[PDB]
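User: Modeling request: complex.
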Amino acid sequence: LDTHFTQYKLARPYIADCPNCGHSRCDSPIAIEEVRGDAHAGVIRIQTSAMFGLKTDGVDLAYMSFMNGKTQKSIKIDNLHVRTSAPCSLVSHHGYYILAQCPPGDTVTVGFHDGPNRHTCTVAHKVEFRPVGREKYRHPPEHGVELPCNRYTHKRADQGHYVEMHQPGLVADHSLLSIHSAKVKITVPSGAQVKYYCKCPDVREGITSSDHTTTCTDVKQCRAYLIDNKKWVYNSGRLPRGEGDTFKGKLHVPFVPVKAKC
Amino acid sequence: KYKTKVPSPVVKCCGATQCTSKPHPDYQCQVFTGVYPFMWGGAYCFCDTENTQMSEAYVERSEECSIDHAKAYKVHTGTVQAMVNITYGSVSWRSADV
Amino acid sequence: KAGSFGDLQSRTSTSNDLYANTNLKLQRPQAGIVHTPFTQAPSGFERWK
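Assistant: Request completed. Predicted assembly structure:
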């Protein structure tokens, strides 16, 4: 499990805007992009914006790191649920990406249970599972002939493709912009790069430790930003660009479509 | 089948970001204004109409394109073959490709 | 033609260049939220199957 520190060390659990996140559009770390109900074997390969797998550091694929706050939470996978019209069956996770055996469904609906909260994410995607053959089943049987289906792997030791994964752009965090008893007070995560100014005229870039704000007062007119590009991300459509550059971070895909005989 | 592998849009907070026609296949890109993008802290860009959003998306081969893919051909006539067996005479065997 | 067979047309698998008439038309994201409306014909490889 120690052959894809390309992603693991260098990628973080991204957080994006889930479309119907239980109530409505939240920002879930497990925000679902790139649903692929394109194989045959009852399987879908999915990308969460969350990077489950090993922890932050080095151990155990079967643990669970999403983003809570600006921060990760690299803990156990205990109660994952992918589901559709019916509850799916997990197949395997690696990186941002999960494979799961699902039935057909008009939608796709994903979610774990942190323990205090359900904290799920759901999405539209037309799903079907034709098996390969002149029989139009709805589901794979126990028996019958084997013949060349299209299907994704169980495994991770995989290089057949790689998707670009360069930096994150900034992100909002108004937990930073506290008040210095009359002035709006920004802080920093760990010395990270906070990009700051307000509608009024004060400090105009922000590459700093914890600053104050001489001019403006209201939290609601200031730039609470986190240039925290110590770990790259997936290049989700629900990502804001890191305006500076196309940083490196070419990173594989585990779940290649392969010529399994279903 | 395609995959609309969207590059992550730009969001300039106060003023325009003109797009250019990058050479990606079917590089569709259109600037947009009039946003207020809720991203994890409510909105983050402090303007309200000068909030600009530049969406860009190009077409790319699926990962299935490598493996699950139709394939066209211009087909001419070529030359036909056969593994003709002759269990000849008293020779009683030859199974040759011709 | 987009939607019709061969909306994507790559010479081979390696060929980075191609022809993608997919009628891909981006629309503006809604109500001040980050996302990317891509309005597109599902492929003429989806149909054709």
